[PDB]
């Protein structure tokens, strides 16, 4: 089997991408944030604290003939951005882009933190990290991809995120029309439950490539590219008036700037992030200070190849017995 679903920026900045997910019978379509940096499929639901729902589409398990309470199961998750959600769990039929998993753990939010409530466009998350990170207790649950894997033509999904445009998540096949050149595959460590790999280095603009190992995660659920402060300083040093602002919480640059590209290495291959991808627009409406899409990972404890990096590539999440990560230009 295969699935293919369009993923759509939630706003003009590509702050996140939502992918329609059918849950239950008859289908309830929720727009979920596919997150290769987490392993919970959780949704706004009929159970979510009413004051914490503001425009989201909710899953109502009671309207799904295939929903079953996973008795006693609860979940609680805190993301790298300080957001959180928790609740109970149903099993239900979940389809993504024509690919159906029966018995998917659908984690029903009772509580969501303010950032979720405030984002009316995101009805929940569909985690695509390793199921070892799943927060369901006392019985940890598998991700959608883990549940689908055995049925897929190939144990892979691909992320083809758009810059200011829809992209595609494919399950079980590699669209050889979706990228240029070859896919370069690179080793993954699952030791932290992430799609963790080692970039072979970087270049800033037309600058010489710096060969240096950068351990990071391929995280579709993270907007920006978070790299060691040395790399990020090197990048922003090439933008007149760019500065790290503690008040704003990262590098800002003059909205009048033309950003340089950022290249990151995948083995001997190079993925070029156009400078426009690194522009996250005014820090506040009407500000002439723009937020940078390349930020220091120093305060995180992990480098994150988020959407800024991944949308420059066709990315293969190879969930074979030995997982690997493929990057292609597109």
DSSP 141-199: ---HHHHHHTTSSSSEEEEE--SSS-EEEEES---TTSSSS-PEEEE-B-TTSS-EEEE
Q: Are residues 15 and 164 in the same domain?
A: yes
Question: Of 174, 198, 233, which residue sits at a domain end?
Answer: 174
Question: Of 145, 174, 203, which residue sits at a domain end?
Answer: 174
Two tokens, residue 60: 């109502």
Question: In the sheet that 289-292 helps form, which strands lie side by side, from edge to edge?
Answer: 243-245, 250-254, 289-292, 279-282
308: number of Cβ within 10 Å? 26
Residues with catalytic roles: 35, 199
Cβ partners under 8 Å of residue 299, min gap 6: none
Q: Which of 121, 96, 100, 123 is nearest to 6 (CA)?
A: 96
Q: Are residues 169 and 198 in the same domain?
A: no
How far apart are alpha carbons 220 and 225 in whole angstroms? 10
165: number of Cβ within 10 Å? 10
Q: Are residues 165 and 258 in the same domain?
A: no
Q: Are residues 293 and 240 in the same domain?
A: yes
Number of H helices, E strands in the chain: 4, 24
Cβ partners under 8 Å of residue 174, min gap 6: 154, 156, 158, 183, 316, 326
Q: Are residues 78 and 155 in the same domain?
A: yes
Q: Are residues 224 and 324 in the same domain?
A: yes
How far apart are alpha carbons 249 and 254 in whole angstroms? 15
- Owning domain of residue 126: 5-174
In the chain, the N- to C-terminal Cα span, in Å, equals: 25
Where residue 172 falls (left for φ over 0; alpha for ψ -120 to 50; beta otherwise) is left
Please state, in angstroms and as integers, the Cα–Cα distance from residue 190 to each residue in 17, 88, 228, following that order: 24, 26, 21
Count of domains observed in the chain? 2
Cα 26 from chain centre: 28
Q: Are residues 110 and 14 in the same domain?
A: yes
Q: At how many Å resolution was this determined?
A: 1.3
């Amino acid at each position: 089997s295969t699935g293919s679903a369009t993923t759509t920026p939630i706003d003009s900045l590509d702050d996140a991408y939502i992918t329609p997910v059918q849950i239950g019978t008859p289908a309830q379509t929720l727009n979920l944030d596919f997150d290769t940096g987490s392993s919970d499929l959780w949704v706004f639901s009929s159970e979510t604290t009413a004051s914490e729902v503001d425009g989201q589409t909710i899953y109502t398990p009671s309207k799904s003939t295939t929903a079953k309470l996973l008795s006693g199961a609860t979940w609680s998750i805190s993301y790298g951005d300080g957001s959180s959600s928790s609740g109970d769990v149903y099993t239900d039929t979940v389809s993504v882009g024509g690919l159906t998993v029966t018995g998917q753990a659908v984690e029903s939010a009772k509580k969501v933190s303010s950032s979720f409530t405030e984002d009316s466009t995101i009805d929940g998350l569909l985690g695509l990290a390793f199921s070892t990170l799943n927060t369901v207790s006392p019985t940890q649950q598998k991700t959608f991809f883990d549940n689908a894997k055995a049925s897929l033509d190939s144990p892979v999904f691909t992320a083809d995120l758009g810059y200011h445009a829809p992209g595609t998540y494919n399950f079980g096949f590699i669209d050889t029309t979706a990228y240029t050149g070859s896919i370069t595959y690179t080793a993954v460590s699952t030791k932290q439950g992430f799609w963790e790999w080692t970039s072979t280095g970087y270049a800033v603009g037309s600058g010489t490539f710096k060969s240096t190992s950068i351990d990071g995660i391929a995280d579709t659920g993270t907007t920006l590219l978070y790299l060691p402060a040395t790399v990020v300083s090197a990048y922003w040093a090439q933008v007149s008036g760019a500065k790290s602002s503690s008040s704003v919480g990262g590098y800002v640059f003059p909205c009048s700037a033309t950003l340089p590209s950022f290249t990151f290495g995948v083995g001997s291959a190079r993925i070029v992030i156009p400078g426009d991808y690194i522009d996250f627009g005014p820090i506040s409406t009407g500000s002439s200070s723009c937020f940078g899409g390349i930020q220091s990972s120093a305060g995180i404890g992990i480098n994150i190849f988020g959407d800024v990096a991944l949308k420059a590539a066709f990315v293969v999440f190879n969930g074979a017995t030995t997982p690997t990560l493929g990057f292609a230009s597109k």
